[PDB]
Amino acid sequence: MNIISTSVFVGPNTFARTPLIRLTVPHYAEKLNTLGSEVYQALDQVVPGMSSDPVEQAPGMLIARLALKLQHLAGMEGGIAFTSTSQADDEAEVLYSYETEDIGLEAGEVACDMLVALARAEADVRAVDLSHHIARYLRYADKRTLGPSAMELVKAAQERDIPWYRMNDASLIQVGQGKYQKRIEAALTSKTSHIAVEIAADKNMCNQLLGDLGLPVPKQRVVYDEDEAVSAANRIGYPVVVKPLDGNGRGVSVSLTDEQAVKKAYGLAEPEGSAVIVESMIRGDDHRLLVVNGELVAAARRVPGHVAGDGIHTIRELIALVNQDPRRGVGHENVLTRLELDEQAIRLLQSYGYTADSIPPSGEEVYLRKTANISTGGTAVDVTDVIHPDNKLMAERAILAVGLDVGAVDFLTTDITKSYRETLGAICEINAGPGLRMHISPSEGKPRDVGGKIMDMLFPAGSQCRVPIAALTGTNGKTTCARMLSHILKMAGHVVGQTSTDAVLIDGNVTVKGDMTGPVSAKMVLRDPSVDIAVLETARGGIVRSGLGYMFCDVGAVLNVTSDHLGLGGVDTLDELAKVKRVIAEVTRDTVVLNADNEYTLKMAAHSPAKHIMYVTRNPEHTLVREHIRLGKRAVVLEQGLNGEQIVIYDNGMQIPLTWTHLIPATLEGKALHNVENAMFAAGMAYALGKTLDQIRSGLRTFDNT
């Protein structure tokens, strides 16, 4: 199972983005014949997801499915696996879904390596070292997949059908298209101010700002000119904390309840750094309060790794019980780490008057860690529903004060259920771009759709202008139809992005020259911050090599089928091209516009999922068109009559006469059937796109193809 050649479909070519692999094997027949039952059973151990089909053993399906499952293992959305017979005997092309190119490609190569290796098994009956391939693949994928704050935002975007694109890799994503584009970088949005981020970083400034708004901020903290610290301790109120200002030899004296403890603490703190500082002791658990749109959307308590007593089991036993938790480990699927009886745990138990062999009573929580982390063993606990309203308001107020779109309050308290007014809780810091990891799928309690909240902030349903309208013309070598349409739209007041297959244009200007294949040309336009609407002429070769550069179009048209022109290969007559161009019809959502005077084009109507089928014909009595018209369906018809030789639009069973053919300068008083078609399609599309007849008439009149 070697690889000869690959291509990647960025967009639809069939239905959805997918790589193609041309593979060769030759113990080819032996490979299949010798599988028996033993191979699927071997794969059932390493990749159990494919246990569902041990029957279609054709190697094409095995490879496609294995590559697909590798991606699923790495967290890909359930996709599709296919096989197709190649040009040579005992040769195959395989296709499977992908998310990221590098990963899809690797999954293919690894699926091959995994299968090739079995050929060296000889007279075996067991899987040998298959997990090594798996590990390698995941190590690679995990460095390339999107980080969880961003992944959850994207998932929300997918649920809400907001398009998104990675830019600058990492966690930075463009969301929305054209002039409506917003950006997200993990938990920050493009709305978030630079100043608010600076402030969140500057803990001292942050404390001052929040303190002045009456927020529970442990600002405090100053022994001015190393004056008597005791006086401060007495003014603050015991218990107190005496620490050096400079957090480098930073021994810290805590829980001081006597002047003598303070005097000692001062002398100890004195030599470290430029200053010594004194603040009240604040204890409790570490909470994160997440605010997204001047509204708290989630809150969670960070709990250091611990055990809870029952009066039955020793701490050793309780830890053993905790580590039965399958979520604990350092494997790919392990979110939490194991709870370990290390030195810190022992120091803490001594501090509590316990040992490893002690048995805590029912309901006592014993922290085995000095601070919460996930990597040290620890948990996130949802407390969103039980936040005292004062604390909710506090959080909202604090984030507002800083000026973040999205941020979280690092808030310490003994009980979040009680107001901060009554419990000396405190804001420790403000987190700009906070992790969403602990609020979505927290360790205990219900999750919160925080990703949703952010995307809803960016693109509220009101004027949810997530996208410019995309149209595509299935041309037959002429950019004229596309130019007529973009021209109408420009005159109509749109900034239109369009592709010409050898160029990308914005408004009237050309920005990009080169082989403007589907993928690149669409992206050039869709990401352009000035664009209202896109016209996107697509190269036949683009569809063949990489597929469409976009996932679907609102309006799309097929004008013709063939000519004596550059081939793509395969049939290159009325066939092949029909299927190449059909793909546009297949992804048109609102209105698909078909040349009804062309049999191969007309048939495409059977496959399009478009809400409306508009027929274009030069025959006022085309049988089929008149029927569709009678029923209220759309058509563009060239007609003679008492109003002259005119193009009339039909919709809802009514004639909507548009203009004279002699008033369109691309014709020579209508003896230019190719431009008549171009105009009828451009007009059809413009109508579907909701332009007025005056705008369409004006556009076609004011059209100058030079």
Q: Which residues bind a copy of itself (CB under 8 A)?
A: 167-168, 172, 183, 185, 188-199, 202, 205, 209, 212-215, 235-237, 280, 397, 400-401, 403, 421-424, 432, 504, 506, 509-512, 523-524, 527-530
Q: How far is the CB of 529 from a copy of itself (least distance, A)?
A: 5
CA geometry: angle 460, 462, 466, nearest 5 deg? 60
Q: How many residues does the chain have?
A: 706
H helix intervals, 323-441: 343-352, 389-402
| Cβ proximity to a copy of itself, 198 vs 444, nearer residue | 198
Q: Whole-angstrom Cα distance, residue 114 to residue 112?
A: 5
DSSP state of 356: T
CA geometry: angle 446, 452, 454, nearest 5 deg? 115
Q: How far is the CB of 187 from a copy of itself (least distance, A)?
A: 11
Q: How far is the CB of 436 from a copy of itself (least distance, A)?
A: 17
Q: How far is the CB of 539 from a copy of itself (least distance, A)?
A: 19
| Cβ proximity to a copy of itself, 424 vs 656, nearer residue | 424
Q: Beta-carbon neighbour count of residue 632 at 10 Å?
A: 11
Q: How far is the CB of 17 from a copy of itself (least distance, A)?
A: 21
- Spatial CB neighbours of 169, under 8 Å, sequence gap ≥ 6: none
Q: Whole-angstrom Cα distance, residue 682 to residue 664?
A: 12
Q: In angstroms, what CA-CA distances link 409 with 170, 276, 426, 427?
A: 25, 26, 10, 7
- Three-state SS for 127-179 is CCCHHHHHHHHHHHHCCCCCCHHHHHHHHHHHHCCCCEEECCCCCEEEECCHH
Q: How far is the CB of 350 from a copy of itself (least distance, A)?
A: 25
Q: Whole-angstrom Cα distance, residue 155 to residue 227?
A: 56
Q: Do 689 and 589 form a contact (C-beta atoms < 8 A)?
A: no
| Cβ proximity to a copy of itself, 128 vs 195, nearer residue | 195
What residues pair up with 94 in beta bridges, in sequence order? Answer: 21, 83
| Cβ proximity to a copy of itself, 204 vs 623, nearer residue | 204
Q: How far is the CB of 645 from a copy of itself (least distance, A)?
A: 39
Helix or strand holding residue 230 (H, E): helix 229-236
Helix or strand holding residue 96 (H, E): strand 91-96
Q: Whole-angstrom Cα distance, residue 212 to residue 273?
A: 28
Q: How far is the CB of 174 from a copy of itself (least distance, A)?
A: 10
Q: How far is the CB of 184 from a copy of itself (least distance, A)?
A: 8
| Cβ proximity to a copy of itself, 127 vs 504, nearer residue | 504
Q: How far is the CB of 511 from a copy of itself (least distance, A)?
A: 3
Q: How far is the CB of 183 from a copy of itself (least distance, A)?
A: 5
Q: Do 20 and 8 form a contact (C-beta atoms < 8 A)?
A: yes
Helix or strand holding residue 296 (H, E): strand 296-304
570: left (phi over 0), alpha (psi -120 to 50) or beta: left
Q: Whole-angstrom Cα distance, residue 339 to residue 626?
A: 76
Q: Beta-carbon neighbour count of residue 292 at 10 Å?
A: 25
Show the tokens assigned to 476.
């037959």
| Cβ proximity to a copy of itself, 45 vs 234, nearer residue | 234
Burial class of residue 103, CB neighbours in 10 A (0-12, 13-18, 19+): buried
Q: Whole-angstrom Cα distance, residue 101 to residue 164?
A: 16
Q: How far is the CB of 194 from a copy of itself (least distance, A)?
A: 4
Name the 3-class secondary structure at 596.
coil
Q: How far is the CB of 280 from a copy of itself (least distance, A)?
A: 7
Q: Whole-angstrom Cα distance, residue 407 to residue 188?
A: 8
| Cβ proximity to a copy of itself, 214 vs 311, nearer residue | 214
| Cβ proximity to a copy of itself, 113 vs 415, nearer residue | 415
Q: How far is the CB of 516 from a copy of itself (least distance, A)?
A: 11
Q: How far is the CB of 606 from a copy of itself (least distance, A)?
A: 38
| Cβ proximity to a copy of itself, 421 vs 701, nearer residue | 421
Q: Whole-angstrom Cα distance, residue 649 to residue 619?
A: 13
| Cβ proximity to a copy of itself, 377 vs 519, nearer residue | 519
| Cβ proximity to a copy of itself, 192 vs 337, nearer residue | 192
| Cβ proximity to a copy of itself, 361 vs 529, nearer residue | 529
CA geometry: angle 107, 108, 114, nearest 5 deg? 85
| Cβ proximity to a copy of itself, 521 vs 608, nearer residue | 521
- Spatial CB neighbours of 381, under 8 Å, sequence gap ≥ 6: 300, 301, 302, 303, 442, 443, 444, 445
| Cβ proximity to a copy of itself, 396 vs 645, nearer residue | 396
Query: Residue 185 half-sphere exposure, CB side, CA atoms within 13 Å?
Result: 13
Q: How far is the CB of 565 from a copy of itself (least distance, A)?
A: 29
Q: Whole-angstrom Cα distance, residue 474 to residue 466?
A: 25
Q: How far is the CB of 198 from a copy of itself (least distance, A)?
A: 7
| Cβ proximity to a copy of itself, 170 vs 654, nearer residue | 170
| Cβ proximity to a copy of itself, 405 vs 586, nearer residue | 405
Burial class of residue 338, CB neighbours in 10 A (0-12, 13-18, 19+): middle
Q: Beta-carbon neighbour count of residue 270 at 10 Å?
A: 15
| Cβ proximity to a copy of itself, 85 vs 231, nearer residue | 231
